[PDB]
Design a protein around this ligand. Structure first.
Ligand SMILES: O=C(O)CNC(=O)C(=O)O
Ligand SMILES: [Mg+2]
Ligand code: NI
Ligand SMILES: [Zn+2]
Length: 331
């Protein structure tokens, strides 16, 4: 068995190996990368996502989200308070202000320590989940707006044609902006490219151990657990590495820097935070190996998780028993 300790693997494809996206994902899995839940891909030195980022300031963040925490430093939830629209230029200036900027620090470990110590005492503003792309149309390799769609993968593997579309999303971050512990919708893959700015630290639980994280989360968030049998689908709960270690939960961590891709694998729980002003682009995707994960994915039917148009068809075809109840949640 490849990668039996489930370590995060880092790949350095050549420009020739960067041509065929599907084939490279399958290669990484042949080496055991999926066992970690997360892999890093450093693009060949010849590649670029676009020529410059000098002209992005007028992108609108229609609904910036202020991430307000509750709980204790290592075990907390966050809720998202909607703020007034602002441009990316306005948001960058806000991120760099004395109230929101990254503190002085020695290295990524010191910054990580400071994040876990102090996150709950601040409410950073995240420009998350913005439909769009920063890849140049002429970038032919690993262009997250030109990937094969999940609906086409389902149709190729299973023969059924379904409605829905699959487009990327932009994330503009600042110091302390946080992504809560989650797997993807329908336990899909995700791919995330850090276009510019300061790093993003990731934490990940191996897919084979995901239920250990779920059992800890039920213990730590006991009212949420009674409310919903899949409350991590709400994407609000945070648990620190110190707490995970105290409870014996297997996990790994890695920091992504600008110019790097991360891939999350089916049922790989992940969480993390931004170091300072940055912009990432991410999208879900599927492979043949995903189909069985999609059939088994948990679902929120309490109504809180409220998700995309395209997830309807995935539930309807892969999980027809659940369909009915899940759709009562979504209506
Ligand atoms: O970058 C973020 O805030 C969150 N991203 C992801 O969870 C992902 O790419 O799967
Ligand atoms: Mg612009
Ligand atoms: Ni994710
Ligand atoms: Zn729910």
């Amino acid at each position: 068995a490849q990668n039996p300790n489930c370590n995060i693997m880092i790949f350095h494809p050549t420009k020739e190996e960067f041509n065929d996206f599907d084939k490279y994902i399958a290669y990484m899995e042949s080496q055991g990368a999926h066992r970690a839940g997360l892999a890093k891909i450093i693009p060949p030195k010849e590649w670029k996502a676009r020529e410059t980022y000098d002209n992005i300031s007028e992108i609108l963040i229609a609904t910036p989200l202020q991430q307000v925490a509750s709980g204790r430093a290592g075990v907390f939830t966050q809720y998202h308070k909607k703020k007034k629209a602002m441009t990316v230029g306005e948001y960058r200036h806000l991120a760099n202000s004395k109230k929101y900027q990254t503190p002085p620090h020695q290295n990524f470990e010191d910054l990580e320590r400071k994040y876990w110590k102090n996150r709950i005492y601040n409410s950073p503003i995240y420009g998350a989940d913005i439909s769009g792309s920063l890849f140049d149309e002429n970038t032919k390799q690993w262009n997250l707006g030109h990937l094969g769609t999940i609906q086409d993968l389902l149709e190729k593997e299973c023969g059924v044609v379904i409605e829905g579309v699959n487009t990327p999303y932009l994330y503009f971050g600042m110091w302390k902006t946080t992504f809560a512990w989650h797997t993807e919708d329908m336990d899909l893959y995700s791919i995330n490219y850090l276009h510019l700015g300061e790093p993003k630290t990731w934490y990940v639980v191996p897919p084979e151990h995901g239920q250990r994280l779920e059992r800890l989360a039920r213990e730590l968030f006991p009212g949420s657990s009674r409310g919903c049998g899949a409350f991590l689908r709400h994407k609000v709960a945070l648990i620190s590495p110190t707490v995970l270690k105290e409870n014996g939960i297997p996990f790994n961590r890695i920091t992504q820097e600008a110019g790097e891709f991360m891939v999350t694998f089916p049922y790989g729980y992940h969480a993390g935070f931004n170091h300072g002003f940055n912009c990432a682009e991410a999208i879900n995707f599927a492979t043949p190996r995903w189909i069985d994960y999609g059939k088994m994915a948990s679902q929120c039917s309490c109504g809180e998780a409220r998700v995309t148009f395209s997830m309807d068809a995935f539930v309807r075809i892969l999980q027809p028993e659940r369909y009915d109840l899940w759709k009562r949640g979504q209506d």
